[PDB]
Design a protein that fits this description.
The structure is cut from a larger assembly and holds chains A and B.
Chain A (H helix, E strand, L loop, with lengths): L19 H9 L21
Chain B lengths: L21 E2 L18 E2 L7
Antiparallel strand pairs in B: 1-2
The chains are: A mainly alpha, B little secondary structure.
PDB class: transcription/dna/rna
Keywords: RNA Polymerase, Initiation Complex
Entry title: E. coli Transcription Initiation Complex - 16-bp spacer and 4-nt RNA
Chain lengths: ~50, ~50
Amino acid sequence: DYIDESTGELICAANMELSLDLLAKLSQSGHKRIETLFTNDLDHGPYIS
Amino acid sequence: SSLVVLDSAERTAGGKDLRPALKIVDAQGNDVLIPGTDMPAQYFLPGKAI
């Protein structure tokens, strides 16, 4: 769940669909180290997600 | 190589709509037509087709 430290408003929550606009706001919160998931079907399909 | 068309059992969640077929064309890449009609011949291979 990445919050913006400077004000602490909930910009984006855990386990959500990925969109262009929030990526910009996110890296501007000063957080330049994020954690994608590996769900490629076949060997590791989207089960738990 | 022998191609085997997998049934729903080993298919993922996305591969459910794709209905398999061997489509019959010409040397130029044009669709050859079924007898007396304008159908593009699409012989849809059912389950477990070696």
